[PDB]
Design a protein around this ligand. Structure first.
Ligand SMILES: CN(O)C(=O)CC[C@@H](c1ccc(F)c(F)c1)P(=O)(O)O
Ligand SMILES: CN(O)C(=O)CC[C@@H](c1ccc(F)c(F)c1)P(=O)(O)O
Ligand SMILES: [Mn+2]
Ligand SMILES: [Mn+2]
Lengths: 393, 393
């Protein structure tokens, strides 16, 4: 029986993880749920899943949650705040931690699961985008298993040989006959826009979808960040990474082997797939996802990314070579500039341009701990806000 | 250091295997080469690779080889005949047997490697098409490792989980999270021909790469035979097999999992890839095959086979359910009817129709040994010859 702590239970990943649990009650049991301020959805989850613990962001939410759980007869014990969330991530009889709290708030709880030697269903980009070296060192030192839940990394991982899958952070790609990792992305809505029109695209043209990630997919900042992550996670050099546009997103990513073989994972866009794969690894369970119907697909195509069309993708690649200050700064800047584009303060092409300008303006030492990473992030947001103000009168 | 016996060294699979050995001298050494009557090529192969043994079909061929090797100072000892080939397949210090002799002549030498507990690089169809129950029983008893060299099966194999790979025959697909095996094929040159034109196709049109295999691709007999083999090799029921047309042949075949994931192997058409995959398993070597270039591919498409277009594929699926007498008779009838079509004695559509007629005429007790299978084969060829003469005056 796998016992689970779900960090970020009330977002789509958390609900989807719960759907796997709901349909596999003989294999998984929820011990702890952690969320933010969504008391109502947390009530329903505690009543369906009977975890021992639930944690909210603050005392106000925790008190509401307590009152409502109590009204319904629940035995779930209610806590609040960051430490409590780290504590659930490290609980003694927990086997797996779904690490789905995103942003800076996901860093310490994910690191607490790692240092407790858990199996971490990794479902946030900040861990490896901002703290990849810190976190990969902690994984080695603490004997944690990372299992990537993100669609492209989960596909690479399914496509990697068993000795790498079980030894992330140590495994040598080359020694295991791996030539490169083929990280695929859709190329976004402006994949075929003449370059000259990029300057004038609007937030509606760039975006059912998720507006930030949607813009990140238009700039391919999203693949840029996936590139930074994959290199830490899979221990890949620059020459062991290829980024390929694949507009249909049926192939989720691939791995190229020494004999010419390429292994690929394919599927529906439903996150229950990669989530169930990690929960059940090295075995499988039913996820509720429809079997992929190959007779109803668009033709599958591929093309090389053009860095004049996708300067963010190139910027992410160069930031990796500059270290975790640089990838942390790029990520934070990009949150500010995308937000500005979406609020109609700057042009679409000013995302990449101001992302570049913010990195050019910083000169930060390599972070040595999480606090350092938060300090780079805070600083880069400030440099970014000011650049936005320079353009947005 | 892996020591090899190559059964069928002078054909294309044999030459390709030697190309892999040639570029990996630190990993593979040839102990024995077995060929038929091609003395000239066997000389060059013995001279380059210094095997301990060379076996030819007969004493006349063996005497020529011995004279020619003597004149070049070779120490290779020369043998002849079917028993010597079985003895090469069973040698104490051989690890791997490339089983590339095709037809009936390949049955006893493959079975010898299997009864000897060897790693078998399985490169002939008649083994599992005609003797699948016999050979998978002998595999269970000796714990021989089968590694399929044929492109589709090799892809399936690479796409299956590790506990299945390491125990074919005992493996339970369902228990390992596998929903089904996705066997792909091109659909042949008449994939889009109007149905009523089929009756009048000529041999040159069917042969857009042997003429027989070409015709087999056109009728999808080839995929039918592969379907029969895959069921034996992977212990798959009818409901665990799907057959999919994929006209570009870039995907080599796939495996569908319980969580909705599909794993696939892709590559160049070059047989050094699956050969090198089996020789190196569970590691990898360089095979000389260049990396697959995703920016130079046709759009990848898929469609369901239509049994009115391809009645041989349905015949093979049905013959499977009727047992090894049926699949043996089918394969044998097909050698005859295809040869008749190529020699302009029957029409293209008469291949499927006479293949059916031969199976209808046979009253077929289950083979209990290789001699039983050979007797079904011989009798089905006679029934098929007579049916051809019914049509071909
Ligand atoms: C789901 N996921 O992991 C993502 O990274 C989403 C954005 C990506 C994406 C876009 C369109 C799709 F149709 C799809 F499926 C995935 P991209 O970065 O453009 O490849
Ligand atoms: C390579 N191989 O194993 C074969 O069995 C050859 C015939 C097959 C085939 C046909 C055309 C191609 F272009 C190709 F690449 C492979 P099919 O049965 O039609 O899928
Ligand atoms: Mn992703
Ligand atoms: Mn084949």
């Amino acid at each position: 029986m796998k016992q689970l702590t779900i960090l970020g239970s009330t977002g789509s990943i958390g609900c989807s993880t719960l759907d796997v649990v709901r349909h596999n009650p003989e294999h998984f049991r929820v011990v702890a749920l952690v969320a933010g301020k969504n008391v109502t959805r947390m009530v329903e989850q505690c009543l369906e899943f009977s975890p021992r613990y639930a944690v909210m962001d603050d005392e106000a939410s925790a008190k509401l949650l307590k009152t409502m759980l109590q009204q319904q007869g629940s035995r779930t014990e209610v806590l609040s705040g960051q430490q409590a969330a780290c504590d659930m991530a490290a609980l003694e009889d927990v086997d797996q931690v779904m690490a789905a709290i995103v942003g800076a708030a996901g860093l310490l709880p994910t690191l607490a699961a790692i240092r407790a030697g858990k199996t971490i269903l990794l479902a946030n980009k900040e861990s490896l985008v901002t703290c990849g070296r810190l976190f990969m060192d902690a994984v080695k030192q603490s004997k944690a298993q990372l299992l990537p839940v993100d669609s492209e990394h989960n596909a690479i991982f399914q496509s990697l040989p068993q000795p790498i899958q079980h030894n992330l952070g140590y495994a040598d790609l080359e020694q295991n006959g791996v030539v490169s990792i083929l990280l695929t992305g859709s190329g976004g809505p402006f994949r075929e826009t003449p370059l000259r029109d990029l300057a004038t695209m609007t937030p509606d043209q760039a975006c059912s979808m998720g507006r930030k990630i949607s813009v990140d997919s238009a700039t391919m900042m999203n693949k840029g960040l996936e590139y930074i992550e994959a290199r830490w996670l899979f221990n890949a050099s620059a020459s062991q990474m290829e980024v390929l546009i694949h507009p249909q997103s049926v192939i989720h990513s691939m791995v190229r082997y020494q004999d010419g073989s390429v292994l690929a994972q394919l599927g529906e866009p439903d996150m229950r797939t990669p989530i169930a794969h990690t929960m059940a690894w090295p075995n499988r369970v039913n996820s509720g996802v429809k079997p992929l119907d190959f007779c109803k697909l668009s033709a599958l195509t591929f093309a090389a990314p053009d860095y004049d069309r996708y300067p963010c993708l190139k910027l992410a690649m160069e930031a990796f070579e500059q270290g975790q200050a640089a990838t942390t700064a790029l990520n934070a800047a990009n949150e500010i500039t995308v937000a500005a584009f979406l609020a109609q303060q700057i042009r679409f092409t000013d995302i990449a341009a101001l992302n570049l300008s913010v990195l050019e303006k910083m000169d930060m030492r390599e972070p040595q701990c999480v606090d350092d990473v938060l300090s780079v992030d805070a600083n880069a947001r400030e440099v970014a806000r000011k650049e936005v103000m320079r353009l947005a009168s």
